[PDB]
Amino acid sequence: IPKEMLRAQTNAILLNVLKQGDNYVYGIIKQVKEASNGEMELNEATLYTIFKRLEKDGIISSYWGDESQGGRRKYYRLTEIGHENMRLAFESWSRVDKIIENLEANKKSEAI
Amino acid sequence: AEIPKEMLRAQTNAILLNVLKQGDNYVYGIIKQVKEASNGEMELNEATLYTIFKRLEKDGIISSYWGDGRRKYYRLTEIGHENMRLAFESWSRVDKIIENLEANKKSEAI
Lengths: 112, 110
Ligand SMILES: [Au+]
Fold this sequence. Notes:
2 copies of one chain form a homodimer. With 112 residues, chain A is mainly alpha-helical.
């Protein structure tokens, strides 16, 4: 599995987890660990790197939590731009499957 | 907000490797079939293929040979086919992870 594809996957995951609600990193890693039957330990480093991009792009935003409790954790939130990105990713990928669909279709066409 | 470069590259590659999957081919031909399969809309630029093919050839995902004008055919390699398989399986496991996230969310909501 190429690293490019791994980080693309981690991205798909994070946008999705934040879709279901604002979260923090230790929490995000834990929920995916659970939702993948132990199998998927996300890499803190890759998360951090991704959040800098996604914060850059305004796909996510962040705020401080747990300050009332003596803490200072960082909560992330999917933005509207966030939801738009995910929509266009979906639509975009669906368009690609259709192009491939049509390639396979036209192949079987010439075979006739 | 727009679709980032990395996703664009990934998409273009998805398509090219898939054209190769369906049968070894030459570049004029590849671009023509995609033009057809995208209802006229997507006539790739040669240069984009060449850029991409250099990477893929580098990584051993594709290779090339002469056919008899004597065109240059590119072929998905075995490693090629393997990678596409594992990519598919891997991405399917990711849909399940997401599936399961949405499932656990609706669970706690109750
Ligand atoms: Au595939």
